[PDB]
Design a protein around this ligand. Structure first.
Ligand SMILES: Nc1ncnc2c1ncn2[C@@H]1O[C@H](COP(=O)(O)O)[C@@H](O)[C@H]1O
Ligand SMILES: Nc1ncnc2c1ncn2[C@@H]1O[C@H](COP(=O)(O)O)[C@@H](O)[C@H]1O
Ligand SMILES: [Mg+2]
Ligand SMILES: [Mg+2]
Ligand SMILES: [Mg+2]
Lengths: 195, 200
């Protein structure tokens, strides 16, 4: 069951740089196997390359609270209520860094929070038709009574945060995914982290 | 509280123009301490916006997934073939619901009955403007068969009819790990009881 093909079923002819700045835009030139047999001809796709990221949902299991960070994301401007988004702690992963190391470090730099235990939520591709970006989300144990780019730190109840997902007030993929996951898993998580 | 009035977009400079575009946003914005930032620049991948349809069969408690290659998955995935939702770009002049219903037919051979909005999200707003709007669509999952996709767009698509339980377990196992599908299936895990009642 599940996916039909493997990495061996593609031929990446070229990854040609279209733009080289802080990030990159690459033209992938490739062929790939067809479900009915044989290979495609050459196909090209423009792919935004910005490396990958670690994401941390800071959850206080004693108080049933989430810590959110607020900062401007200018790309949200054209389609959003405001470009200041309420987000998860997150950071890009640089060479040799692990997801958990980045998540724990960014919790301290962005929320002023020390993380205790962590558990994986999931790792997802943000928009794989046009970008390679993968983001790996952890939930991290925090004490939301602990006090601390231009960031403002918010502490809200889990119920409020999830209601803001339902209402569309929180609508960035990382936060939606993490908070939907929390809504599905928080009972067991509180059990585990308050035992 | 800040709003768009607290942002000055000085310019958007097109850095690359092809099928998609890369723009440099040049801007200033207020700071929480009450000042105003210096000039900030961000490279923003501009690819327009998308419609996503979660095909749900409420009689059978089944979902229809589509399988297709996403070459950008190659560097970080076991395979670049992904299990995904029906989805398409919204071209100038189109609307979310019409695109969602049309792609359901083009990509999975599905006629869609009722639809309900799930949510609209920004895929990765640090680097792209892309917003995707997810609908759940009422389908008869037994009608999804075969290979679809338009060869004019080099779409080669296989359909997978599975139980909702199996689809969500694949999210848990990492076998479904693209944002649209994760968001849709997590939403469905939270709402399927009421939705099945609604559509019964
Ligand atoms: N879209 C972008 N274009 C150019 N530089 C960026 C972009 N996103 C992030 N950066 C740089 O990376 C840093 C960290 O970004 P972030 O992880 O979004 O806080 C920023 O302070 C910028 O120096
Ligand atoms: N990253 C991309 N670069 C270039 N064209 C693309 C890209 N993604 C989608 N397309 C266009 O959309 C068709 C397939 O769309 P989709 O299957 O929705 O990604 C392709 O034949 C192209 O015309
Ligand atoms: Mg960050
Ligand atoms: Mg599609
Ligand atoms: Mg299509």
């Amino acid at each position: 069951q599940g996916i039909t093909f493997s990495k061996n079923d593609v031929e990446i002819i070229a990854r040609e740089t279209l733009y080289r700045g802080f990030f990159s835009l690459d033209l992938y030139r490739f062929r790939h196997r067809l479900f009915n047999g044989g290979m495609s001809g050459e196909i090209t796709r423009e792919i935004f390359e910005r490396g990958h990221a670690a994401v941390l949902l800071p959850f206080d299991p004693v108080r049933d609270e989430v810590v959110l960070v607020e900062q401007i994301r200018i790309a949200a401007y054209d389609t959003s209520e405001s470009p200041w988004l309420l987000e998860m702690v997150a950071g890009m992963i640089e060479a040799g860094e692990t997801v958990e190391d980045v998540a724990r470090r960014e919790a301290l730099e962005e929320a002023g929070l020390e993380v205790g235990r962590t558990k994986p939520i999931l790792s997802y591709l943000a928009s794989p038709g046009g970008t390679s970006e993968r983001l790996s989300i952890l939930v991290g144990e925090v004490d939301a009574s602990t006090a601390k780019e231009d960031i403002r730190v918010h502490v809200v109840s889990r119920e409020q945060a999830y209601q803001w997902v339902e209402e569309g007030k929180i609508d960035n993929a990382a936060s939606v995914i993490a908070l939907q996951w929390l809504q599905l898993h928080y009972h067991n998580l509180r059990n585990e982290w308050t035992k």
